[PDB]
Amino acid sequence: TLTENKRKSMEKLSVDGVISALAFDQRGALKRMMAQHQTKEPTVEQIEELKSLVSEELTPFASSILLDPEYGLPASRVRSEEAGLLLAYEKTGYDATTTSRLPDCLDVWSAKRIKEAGAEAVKFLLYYDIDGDQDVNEQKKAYIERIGSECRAEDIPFYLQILTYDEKIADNASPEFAKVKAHKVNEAMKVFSKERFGVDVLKVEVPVNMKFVEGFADGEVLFTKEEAAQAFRDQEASTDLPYIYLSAGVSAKLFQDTLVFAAESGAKFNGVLCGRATWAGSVKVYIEEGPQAAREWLRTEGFKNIDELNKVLDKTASPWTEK
Amino acid sequence: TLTENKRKSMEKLSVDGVISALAFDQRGALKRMMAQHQTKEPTVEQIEELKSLVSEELTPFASSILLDPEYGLPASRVRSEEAGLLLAYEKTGYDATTTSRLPDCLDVWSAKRIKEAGAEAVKFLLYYDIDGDQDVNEQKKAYIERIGSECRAEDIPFYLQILTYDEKIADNASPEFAKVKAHKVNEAMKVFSKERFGVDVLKVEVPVNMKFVEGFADGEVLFTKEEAAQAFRDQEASTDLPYIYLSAGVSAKLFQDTLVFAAESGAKFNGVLCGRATWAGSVKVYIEEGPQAAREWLRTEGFKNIDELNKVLDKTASPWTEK
Ligand SMILES: [Ca+2]
Ligand SMILES: [Ca+2]
Numbered sequence: 001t002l003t004e005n006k007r008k009s010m011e012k013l014s015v016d017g018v019i020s021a022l023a024f025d026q027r028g029a030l031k032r033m034m035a036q037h038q039t040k041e042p043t044v045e046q047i048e049e050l051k052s053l054v055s056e057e058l059t060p061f062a063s064s065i066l067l068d069p070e071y072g073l074p075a076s077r078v079r080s081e082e083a084g085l086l087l088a089y090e091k092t093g094y095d096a097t098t099t100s101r102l103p104d105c106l107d108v109w110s111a112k113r114i115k116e117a118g119a120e121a122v123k124f125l126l127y128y129d130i131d132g133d134q135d136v137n138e139q140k141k142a143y144i145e146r147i148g149s150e151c152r153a154e155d156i157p158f159y160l161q162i163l164t165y166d167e168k169i170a171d172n173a174s175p176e177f178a179k180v181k182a183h184k185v186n187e188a189m190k191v192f193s194k195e196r197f198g199v200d201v202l203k204v205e206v207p208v209n210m211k212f213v214e215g216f217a218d219g220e221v222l223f224t225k226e227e228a229a230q231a232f233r234d235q236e237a238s239t240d241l242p243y244i245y246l247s248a249g250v251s252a253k254l255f256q257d258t259l260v261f262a263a264e265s266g267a268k269f270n271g272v273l274c275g276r277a278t279w280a281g282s283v284k285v286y287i288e289e290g291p292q293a294a295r296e297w298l299r300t301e302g303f304k305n306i307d308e309l310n311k312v313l314d315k316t317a318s319p320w321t322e323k
Numbered sequence: 324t325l326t327e328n329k330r331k332s333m334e335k336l337s338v339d340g341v342i343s344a345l346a347f348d349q350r351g352a353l354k355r356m357m358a359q360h361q362t363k364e365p366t367v368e369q370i371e372e373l374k375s376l377v378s379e380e381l382t383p384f385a386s387s388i389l390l391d392p393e394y395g396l397p398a399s400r401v402r403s404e405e406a407g408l409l410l411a412y413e414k415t416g417y418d419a420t421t422t423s424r425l426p427d428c429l430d431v432w433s434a435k436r437i438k439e440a441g442a443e444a445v446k447f448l449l450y451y452d453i454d455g456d457q458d459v460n461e462q463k464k465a466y467i468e469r470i471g472s473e474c475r476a477e478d479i480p481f482y483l484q485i486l487t488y489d490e491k492i493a494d495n496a497s498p499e500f501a502k503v504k505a506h507k508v509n510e511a512m513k514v515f516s517k518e519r520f521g522v523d524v525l526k527v528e529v530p531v532n533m534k535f536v537e538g539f540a541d542g543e544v545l546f547t548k549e550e551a552a553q554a555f556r557d558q559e560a561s562t563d564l565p566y567i568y569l570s571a572g573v574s575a576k577l578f579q580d581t582l583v584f585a586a587e588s589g590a591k592f593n594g595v596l597c598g599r600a601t602w603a604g605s606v607k608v609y610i611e612e613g614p615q616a617a618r619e620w621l622r623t624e625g626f627k628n629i630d631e632l633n634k635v636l637d638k639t640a641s642p643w644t645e646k
Contacts, residue, residue, distance in 0.1 A: 108461045110468040112519060138431045145433040146473055153475035153521075196435060198476075 005155040006200060009120040010320070013064040013084035013157070017319025019201070019244050019271030020310055022278065024054055024075070025068040025088035025123070030283070037287045044071065050286050050294065051075035054279045057298035059083035061306045066123055066273060069109055076118060086159060086273075087119040089147065094127055099167035100136045101127035103143050111150035121157040122147070123203070130187040131180075132167045141191070148198020161203035161246065161273075162188050173249055178209040178222055182231040186238040193239040201320075202243040203273050207231040210250065210258050229265035242270040242320035252277035252305060256312045263316035270320040271313060278305045328478040329523060332443040333643070336387040336407035336480070340642025342524070342567050342594030343384075343633055347377050347398070348391035348411035348446065349598060353606070360610040367394065373609050373617065374398040377602050380621035382406040384629045389446055389596055391415075392432055399441065409482060409596075410442040412470065417450055422490040423459045424450035426466050434473035444480040445470070446526070446596075453510040454503075455490045464520070471521020484526035484569070484596075485511050501532040501545055505554040509561040516562040524643075525566040526596045530554040533573075533581050552588035565593040565643040570600035575628040579635045586639035593643040594636065601628045 002010065013019060030050070034042035048071045055075035059065050064084030067076050076085050089109060094101040103126050114122050124147055126140060144160065151158035164184035169177045185207040192199055208231045212222035223231075235243075245262070247255040255277065262269060281301055286294035325333060336342060349356075350370075357365045371394050378398035382388050387407035390399050399408050412432060417424040426449050437445050447470055449463060467483065474481035487507035492500045508530040515522055531554045535545040546554075558566075568585070570578045578600040585592060602625055609617035 105469070108458075108465045110465045111472055112468050113465065135431070142431045142433045142436065145435050146428075146469065149434055149473040149476040150469055153472040 002200070003155055006157050009084075009157050010200070012120045013086065014271065014320065015063045017270070017321035018063070018313060018317045019242075019273070019320070020063045020313050020317075021086065021244070021271065021273045022054075022058055022062040022065045022083075022306070023246070023273045023275030024051060024279065025066050025072060026276070027068050027070055027092050029092075030071075033280075033283045034287055037284060042287075046287075047071045048074050049291060050283065052078050053286070053291060053294050053298060054282065054302075055079045057295060058279065058302055058306055061303065061310065063271075064120070066275070069106060069114070069117065073117060084120045085118055086121040086123045087114045087117060089114060089122050089124045090126075099129075100133065101129075101165065102136070103127075103140060105147070111147070111154045111156060115154045115156045119156065121159050121200075122151050122154075123159040123161060125161040125163065126192075127163050127165055128184075128188045128191075129165050129167050130184055130191070141197070144192060144197050144199075148196070151200075152198050157200040158198055159201045159203055159273075160192055160197070160199045162192065162205075163246075163248075164188055164205060173209070173211075175212060175220060175222060178212045181205070181209055182207040182234065186231075186235050189235065189238040189243070193241050199241060201270075202239060202241050203246055204235075204243055205248060206245055206258055206262065207235040210254060210261070216254070216257070216261075225261075228261070232262050232265040232267040236267050236269075240323070242323065244271045244273050245269055246272070247274045247277060252309070256309060259312050259316045268318040268322075269316075271317050272309070274309065278302065278309065325480075325523070326478055329480050332407075332480050333523070335443045336409065337594070337643065338386045340593070340644030341386070341636060341640045342565075342596070342643070343386040343636055343640075344409065344567070344594065344596045345377070345381055345385040345388045345406075345601065345629070346569065346596045346598030347374055347602065348389050348395060348409075350391055350393060350415040352415070356603070356606045357610055360607055369609075370394045371397055372614055373605065375401055376609070376614060376618055376621060377605065377625070378402045380618060381602065381625055381629055384626065384633060386594075387443070389598075392429060392437070392440065396440065407443045408441055409444040409446045410437045410440060412437060412445050412447045413449075422452075423456065424488065425459070426450070426463060428470070434470070434477045434479060438477050438479045442479070444482050444524075445474050445477075446482040446484060448484040448486060449515075450486050450488055451507075451511045451515075452488050452490050453507055453514070464514075467515065467520045467522075471519070474523075475521050480523040481521055482524045482526055482596075483515055483520070483522045485515060485528075487511055487528060496532070498535060498543060498545055501535050504528070504532055505530040505557060509554070509558050512558065512561040512566070516564050522564060524593075525562060525564055526569055527558075527566050528571060529568055529581055529585060530558040533577060533584070539577070539580070539584075548584075551584070555585050555588035555590040559590050559592075563646070565646070567594045567596050568592055570595070570597045572599035572603065575600045575632065579632060582635050582639045591641040592639075594640050595632070597632060601625065601632065 059080040382403040389409040
């Protein structure tokens with residue numbers, strides 16, 4: 001169920017019950033991309049400006065935009081008046097020396113402060129290995145309970161992003177991980193759909209690596225179209241919450257093709273929180289050719305990208321209202 | 324204002340609006356006391372047992388008991404039927420290699436789990452130097468906001484304990500700290516009485532080191548009685564929340580005389596969360612003579628301490644229900 005304010009907030013993040021959200025809370029990742037044509041270390045001014053350019057030019061075509069409080073608050077204030085705002089709550093990345101990947105909130109932030117900054121949702125990223133250390137997962141579950149409680153008190157939607165992994169499989173893109181991905185994703189969704197975690201929307205991976213599915217694979221084939229289709233249906237059955245897809249390790253085209261396949265298979269996903277593929281190109285242009293060039297790229301190539309995505313969403317997504 | 328459930332919980336922790344609570348969530352501190360008396364490391368069983376003995380013998384004379392989830396859950400189950408339960412939420416102690424003393428919740432606990440474990444309040448201890456690093460304090464304030472929000476969502480009273488310190492003063496028993504203690508205590512109370520922190524009751528230090536007050540001092544005198552009295556009045560004017568005193572491990576007699584002085588000075592404190600001043604002597608007995616001897620100490624010296632404290636509370640404390 002949703003409280004009146006949470007419902008209203010959800011409405012501000014979507015169009016006709018579909019979430020077509022632009023993800024741009026990248027921090028370290030964006031800086032690194034920038035580093036790729038580096039006269040110097042990329043500045044705070046540069047990072048914040050590029051987020052503002054993307055926000056200004058592309059949010060007229062997105063139902064909402066996800067930003068980080070570190071670099072993204074200026075960008076958040078210049079978003080289209082028709083677009084809602086989500087703010088990221090987690091610290092980026094994880095310790096590569098250990099396998100625990102424990103969650104940690106931004107040090108001077110709280111759900112209250114996120115709401116005060118104008119957000120209509122709190123977004124939090126959790127790494128979860130359902131088969132991992134039981135004590136680690138207990139600590140993780142407790143952490144999410146806390147955040148869910150915060151969001152209930154502040155009456156602001158809780159968007160929980162889950163990225164799955166295996167403590168013992170180094171590469172998420174490996175065939176080894178592909179074989180267990182459906183299990184990692186769908187079981188994690190079952191866990192955090194439980195009422196006690198206070199989640200309003202799940203941001204999740206597609207439950208299969210399409211690069212190993214028949215018809216989509218350029219190399220080894222691990223799954224038939226039917227087995228992949230069943231994974232999407234299993235995922236649909238793993239939660240009664242609204243859920244939306246993230247894009248990871250795939251091109252814009254493959255992602256869009258996957259949304260088509262997802263819908264064809266019977267998945268009732270309620271939209272996406274996608275970004276990188278849409279605005280990636282603007283980054284090279286911005287560093288090299290300046291902000292005015294980047295603005296033009298976003299107005300042209302940028303619009304093309306997000307518009308193609310929206311037209312795919314129009315024929316594949318299902319409304320969260322239709323619960 | 325209290326919600327219906329918070330009020331009911333406050334009622335279970337109090338009698339006629341006065342909190343006569345027994346504090347025994349000590350961990351590191353208890354371990355240190357125990358250290359003073361034996362060769363070996365204290366065992367889990369010994370810590371759990373002594374906590375259960377104090378709970379069994381003394382909670383018939385307290386309106387509630389504060390315990391720690393780590394060693395205190397068995398003790399919580401054998402408390403008097405008439406006594407309420409608070410559970411601690413913070414990890415014990417602080418990092419002595421730095422001056423920030425940052426707060427940290429127990430890893431596998433949440434406010435929801437504390438409530439599920441039968442507690443009628445969440446207690447959290449924060450070290451705070453009002454004059455300290457501003458970024459450190461911003462992080463501390465954000466952290467308390469989160470907990471206050473949790474407690475609002477779970478509809479469970481939030482007891483915030485504040486222990487003051489100075490980043491540049493090593494010993495809080497020193498005359499140097501004594502001269503700034505009132506400032507540290509009263510300004511901290513003011514800050515954490517702000518609505519945004521969601522506190523229901525403050526557990527605080529008396530705003531004076533009584534050992535340096537004329538009439539109480541056996542050595543150097545830093546303060547006249549009128550100056551000490553004014554600090555208590557300043558404290559009363561620093562919050563409109565209920566507040567209760569901790570004993571800080573002074574003698575039972577000095578704590579009792581302090582409460583009388585507080586009341587005479589004009590402090591409208593609403594009770595105590597008193598630990599060491601009551602049961603401290605049981606530790607030596609339990610270690611050296613065993614549980615039965617400790618039980619007999621509690622039934623005699625322990626009772627005498629808490630009985631005389633209750634008599635003093637009866638004539639000094641002010642009801643929270645008058646608010
Ligand atoms: Ca107020
Ligand atoms: Ca007052």
